[model samples]
Target: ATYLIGDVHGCYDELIALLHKVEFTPGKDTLWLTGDLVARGPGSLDVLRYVKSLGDSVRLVLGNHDLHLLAVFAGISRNKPKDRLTPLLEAPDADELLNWLRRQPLLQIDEEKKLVMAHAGITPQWDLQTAKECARDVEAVLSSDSYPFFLDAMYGDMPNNWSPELRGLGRLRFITNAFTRMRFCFPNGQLDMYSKESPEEAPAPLKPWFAIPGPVAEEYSIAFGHWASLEGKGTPEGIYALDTGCCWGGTLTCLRWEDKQYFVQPSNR
Candidate 1:
């Protein structure tokens, strides 16, 4: 069976506890993550190490926070004041860990189960095939020799919508943002990079991407992290918002993919 987890955000102890709650049996069960495995809390290093240690037991998508960490490591972006990632940067195994991180994808799909997951959510303009192709467009850059250039290029928010005609760094940047940072988007597919409010709080002309009917949702059930404010409230078309905000003194949540059953562990705080 497959088990899906929400954004960890460096809440390592909670992660272990939730694993225990679910009685996860490695090798017997596959674990999936919605990402943001590090940052904004203590245990950033421990989280990375533990998840990496799990090997084939796990699959993870890349969150915005995870990308920011990569950008910092690449000297493309400076560490943020509250990032809480210094320990990870200072670890003796930092190279080994970051290399492993660099190999992780921004999107994970189980086509047989009709389930798709990303750190944020998919853009409105693409179907599953197109989304996967676009993600690969960035992943090629992310996992290649040109990664440093792409990391540096990933810093902006302009040209906020996906266009088939877009090319070069701008093309990769748009694909990366849609899969890792998007929250609300204009009906025309323009992204709102600054909004952190819940869906109810969204201003006119902006709505949560999953709230509207779209082809991707019609084709597959989507599970996502990021937007802790969403608090598991998602659309009726099988879009599961899994980030319950454990790093913010909330709970860590997990869902059993086969049964659609869920379990939660309150923050130790």
Candidate 2:
């Protein structure tokens, strides 16, 4: 069996309970995570340790918060007290855990399952191929000696539209934003990084990314988190919304890929 869980956000106890409820078996059953594995909740350190310990059984993607954590670790950004990440940052094994985290991908694809997973939804402008290439581009920088420089340049939301001619940090920033912080997008397929409103209330010209027609949605089922207000609802066919806002006192959600069965654990907050 394969289970995909959404946005742990340091709700370690709820994560464990969801896994136990699903009867997750370490080596036998695989666990796929839509990242933001740490921050906000009380046990980010434990969450990171446990996920890292899972090793081969885990397939994970990086979320915006996760990227922010890496930036904080690199001294490019300061930690927010509200995120409660100081303990994890100060941990003796912080280097090891963060290094492992920086290596994780921004996207994961299962061709057989016809599924794709990212922290935020994929941009409507890209097909699966383009998404892969863009993800690899950022992944290369994040895992290289130039990662600190990448992190320093990773902020801001300019160049919200994607262009093949886009080069350097602008290109990487767009890719990173599309994969992690995106929620609403302009109807022209331009990303609107500022809007967090639900689809119904997003105002004219700004639609949820999944609502826009695109090539990726035509070929692959997308599983994503980062938008908790959706509550796993309102996406079109072939799209799955997994973040249920556990860090904000909502349930943690899991989807069993084999049967499309959903398992949820109430927040222990």
Candidate 3:
């Protein structure tokens, strides 16, 4: 059995409870994480260590907070004091941990299950194959020796439109933003990065990225966890919103992938 978890966001205890609630078996069952494993909560370090200890039984994608951690580790930016990620940065195994984390992809696909998991959402213009190719393009650079170069140039929202002809840093930045930072986007596939509101609350000219039709999303079971505002609501058919805002006094959410049976643990902290 495979279990998919939403954004952990340093809510360590909640994760543990939900894991136990669902009877997670490290060697026998699979765990798929939708990213944001750390940041904005008290136990970011604990969450990282626990997930790292899981070995091949775990599959994860990179989220915005996870990328921020890498950016800070690469010395491209200072750790946000409010993020609660400084402890992870100062840990003795910081280098080892961050190295492992940076090597993770922005996307994971279970072909047999017809599932596509990403931190945020995929771009409408790209099909699943194209999306995989684009993700691999960025993943290669991120996992390569010159990874710091990409991290340093990763922090912008310009070039919001996707084009096959885009090249260099701008290309990589747009790919990164689409997978990890995108929420609301225009129907023409232009990204709207300024809004963080729920679907109805969003300002004009912006709709949740998944609301816009896309081949990848329409063809596969899309599971993502970046936007907690939805409260796990507004999921279109074949799409799943797993982030339940666990770090914000909400419950941690998990879904038994094959059956789509959900298990949630209330945030006791």
Candidate 4:
């Protein structure tokens, strides 16, 4: 069985309870995380440490917040001490956690189970292979010392449309944003980062990533969690929106693959 969780965002206790609510088993079951494991709450450090200890039984994709933490710790991005992530940055396990996180794949495809895991949604312009290649490009840089170089390069909002000619940080940043922070984009694939609402409230030109027609690897189930404004409500088909906005007083959500199944746990709040 596979259990994929949404953004924990430092809600460690709620995460634990959700795991229990789903009766998660370390060996018998595998847990997949949709990222944003740390940040935005008082328990940021604890959440990171707990997820780190899970070893191979647990898998995680990066979220914007996770990357932000790594970037901030690496001195590429500045995070105010008020962010509540200082303790995590100071932890001895910080090195290991960061290293492991850096090595994690931006996308995971399980052909047998018929599942595709990404932090956010991909554009209609590229198919799965293209998406995988783009992700690997950044992943390679991140695993290398050049990771910081790319992190510095990682910030951007231009050249939103995908093109074979799009190189350097422009391509990488756009891909990263699509896979992590994106909620809506114009038909041309330019992300509209200003809005953080759900598909119902999307602007005229902006549409959900999944709405992009005839994209690659469309046959498999797509799992994501970046948008929490909808709470635990997800999209149609097999696209699982794991994030339930737990830290924001919403339920923490999870699902068991092939079971057509989903489970939710209430927050301590």
Clashing pairs in 1: none
Clashing pairs in 2: none
For candidate 4, list the clashing residue pairs, or say none.
none
Q: Which candidate model has the greater lDDT, 1 or 3? A: 3
Question: Residue 54 error for model 1, in Å?
Answer: 1.7
Candidate 2 regions off by >4 Å?
none
Over 4 Å off in model 3, which ranges?
none
- For candidate 2, lDDT tens digit of each residue in 1-269? 99999999999999999999999998899998999998999889999999999998999999999999999999999889999999999999999999999999999999999989999979998988899999999999999987999999989899899999999889999999999999998889999978786888778888889999999988899999999888888998899999999999999999999999999999976
TM-score of each: 0.97, 0.98, 0.97, 0.94
- Higher-scoring candidate on TM-score, 1 or 3: 3
Could you tell me how far off, in angstroms, the CA of residue 167 lies in candidate 3 after the best superposition?
Answer: 0.6
46-142: candidate 3 lDDT, tens digit per residue: 9999999998999999999998888888888888788998889899999989899888888899889989999997878778887888899998988
Best-performing candidate as measured by TM-score:
2
Model 1: weakest 10-residue lDDT segment is: 230-239
By lDDT, the better pick of 1 and 2 is: 2
- Poorest 10 consecutive residues of model 2 by lDDT? 193-202
